[PDB]
UniProtKB/Swiss-Prot annotation, chain A:
(Microbial infection) Deamidated at Gln-25 by Photorhabdus asymbiotica toxin PAU_02230, blocking GTP hydrolysis of heterotrimeric GNAQ or GNA11 and G-alphai (GNAI1, GNAI2 or GNAI3) proteins, thereby activating RhoA. It is linked to Auriculocondylar syndrome 1: An autosomal dominant form of auriculocondylar syndrome, a craniofacial malformation syndrome characterized by variable mandibular anomalies, including mild to severe micrognathia, temporomandibular joint ankylosis, cleft palate, and a characteristic ear malformation that consists of separation of the lobule from the external ear, giving the appearance of a question mark (question-mark ear). Other frequently described features include prominent cheeks, cupped and posteriorly rotated ears, preauricular tags, and microstomia. The lineage of its organism: Eukaryota, Metazoa, Chordata, Craniata, Vertebrata. Residues 145-150 are annotated as: G5 motif. Changing residue 70 to H: Decreased affinity for PLCD4. The chain holds residues 180 to 354 of 354 of the full protein. Changing residue 39 to A: No effect on binding to PLCD4. Mg(2+) binds at residue 2. Changing residue 73 to A: Increased affinity for PLCD4. Changing residue 69 to M: No effect on binding to CCDC88C. Belongs to the G-alpha family. G(i/o/t/z) subfamily. It comes from Homo sapiens (Human). This is Guanine nucleotide-binding protein G(i) subunit alpha-3. Residues 86-93 are annotated as: G4 motif.
Swiss-Prot record, chain B:
Transmembrane segments: none annotated. The keyword Phosphoprotein applies. PROSITE patterns: WD_REPEATS_1, WD_REPEATS_2, WD_REPEATS_REGION. Changing residue 28 to F: In MRD42; uncertain significance; no effect on protein abundance; no effect on complex formation with gamma subunit; no effect on trimer formation with alpha and gamma subunits; no effect on receptor-driven G protein activation. Guanine nucleotide-binding proteins (G proteins) are involved as a modulator or transducer in various transmembrane signaling systems. The beta and gamma chains are required for the GTPase activity, for replacement of GDP by GTP, and for G protein-effector interaction. The modification Phosphohistidine is found at residue 264. Phosphorylation at His-264 by NDKB contributes to G protein activation by increasing the high energetic phosphate transfer onto GDP. The gene is GNB1. This is Guanine nucleotide-binding protein G(I)/G(S)/G(T) subunit beta-1.
Swiss-Prot record, chain D:
This is Guanine nucleotide-binding protein G(I)/G(S)/G(O) subunit gamma-2. It comes from the Eukaryota. GO terms for biological process: adenylate cyclase-activating dopamine receptor signaling pathway; cellular response to catecholamine stimulus; cellular response to prostaglandin E stimulus; fibroblast proliferation; G protein-coupled receptor signaling pathway. Belongs to the G protein gamma family. It comes from Homo sapiens (Human). It is a lipid-anchor. The lineage of its organism: Eukaryota, Metazoa, Chordata, Craniata, Vertebrata. Expressed in fetal tissues, including testis, adrenal gland, brain, white blood cells and brain. Guanine nucleotide-binding proteins (G proteins) are involved as a modulator or transducer in various transmembrane signaling systems. The beta and gamma chains are required for the GTPase activity, for replacement of GDP by GTP, and for G protein-effector interaction. Keywords: Acetylation, Cell membrane, Host-virus interaction, Lipoprotein, Membrane, Methylation, Prenylation, Transducer. The keyword Lipoprotein applies. The gene is GNG2.
Amino acid sequence: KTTGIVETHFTFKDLYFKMFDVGGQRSERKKWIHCFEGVTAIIFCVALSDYDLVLAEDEEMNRMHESMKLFDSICNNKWFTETSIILFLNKKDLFEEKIKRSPLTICYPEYTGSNTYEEAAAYIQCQFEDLNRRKDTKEIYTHFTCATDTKNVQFVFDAVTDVIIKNNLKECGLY
Amino acid sequence: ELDQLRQEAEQLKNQIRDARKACADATLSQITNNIDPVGRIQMRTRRTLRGHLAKIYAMHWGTDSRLLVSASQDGKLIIWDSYTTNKVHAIPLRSSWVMTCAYAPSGNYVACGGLDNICSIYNLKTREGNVRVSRELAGHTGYLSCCRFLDDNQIVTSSGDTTCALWDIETGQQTTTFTGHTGDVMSLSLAPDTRLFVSGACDASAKLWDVREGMCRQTFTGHESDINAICFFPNGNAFATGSDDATCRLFDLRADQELMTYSHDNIICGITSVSFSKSGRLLLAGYDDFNCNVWDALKADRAGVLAGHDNRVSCLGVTDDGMAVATGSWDSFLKIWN
Amino acid sequence: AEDKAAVERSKMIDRNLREDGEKAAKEVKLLLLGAGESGKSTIVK
Amino acid sequence: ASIAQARKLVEQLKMEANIDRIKVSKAAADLMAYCEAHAKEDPLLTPVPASENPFRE
């Protein structure tokens, strides 16, 4: 019935997770983005199918080039200096199917590689992971996923455990 | 085509500007220059309130100037007692994203709000010995960023939908909708007679609505960034604002003009709360740099400073009788200065 | 008398808040961002 | 399309145009008079020592 923050709860191996889907707020972000200062990590989702063939209700605004802008803005906020990001690249089957017909050069100006799926995915990950400038404080976890992949929960669990461990070493001064 | 309408609007705005530049015979500083100032104002903490565990976002003094109400980024809502620091009530909340709170003039109800885009009323009065949700008011699209009780049955709320509204607590459907702002409304205060109110939004402007006709009648500008706080002068003929430009300004309704600005060259952080003392001689402002300032409304010179918080100050208020000032900060503490 | 009763009420309230905070401190909070029409629904399942 | 919005804005501006305005020198005088009329009862201006102050320990 409610609109605005949406919350989901689940457990895995004696841990409790809380996920906030605040993406339906539809207002100015800058007035409420600081209410989340203290979250363990940020989960980001990017669809590999937008590399081309779909712009967004516009004329020269690529969907991937807007996802990159949002990632750049979010990763470099003043409130998110110490919070790591878990980046999910979804819908790889469509990417593999569309590489054979539509090359990757239509999205980014210079090379991709073999116009082969293995080589384009790595370049996209490298391009998307180079938008952070807080490399001394935060880290990025990337995991290609599809509509059939079923090992995402263990990736999230392990990334959260690693983030917690490194956070404590920092407090103690060790790292 | 539409250019004719643009030209007509420009001509109307030019006429407004010309009419405004006429009553300005004089200045407010010139009239009040030949008077005796107040001097140096020194205040110290008297009571400290502990018990919260997260950032504090709202506060509202009671109508008897004894009990408080505080909202933190948890599901909790504590009714305080500044005379003897013993809590009275603690109300859990469904969504832990509270942004504002209010205390009813009858001392029987409170209110909340936040990113859930819903305002809720709690029966603090005798309800077999506990508190439960009375009504949830839905219909806003964006987050709710202020709310004030008019009576035990009517409440005015402002939201991030660039829209304010007047509700009916007995029915739950809003009876009047105030539109015209192009930005997210951030603040809202009521006049002493409860027949007019003002608002401020993320577009630099302030409007003067009336609860009966439901129409704007005056628009005040002057700031160059978002506006976060607003409150009326005790006489009801003036109000003060606070923006992200580190400046506070004073406006008067009858003259439709801007009187004074309160600023300094050592302040860059924006204001988060604005309040007048009784008789309007002292203006209180809370800033981002952990500090609270006391101004002089008539002459615009600093008269004191308050420094007891280690984090940003998000709210402040003055009792009905003007006997105390309460401050809330982004840590989990409150303080009372006198 | 009344002051005493207020004291026990405050102490019970403080105990309840302490227990609530202790229970809430043991949970992992995740903010799920993402671009529009890109997914963020399959991940939920 | 936007013609209705433009006409509504023009009507609002026209409504705000025809209003009565007093001079600043009178509003300032009234503000000063109110400030000086109630300054004798303003505890934040003069601290009463421990007599009526409820926050003295």
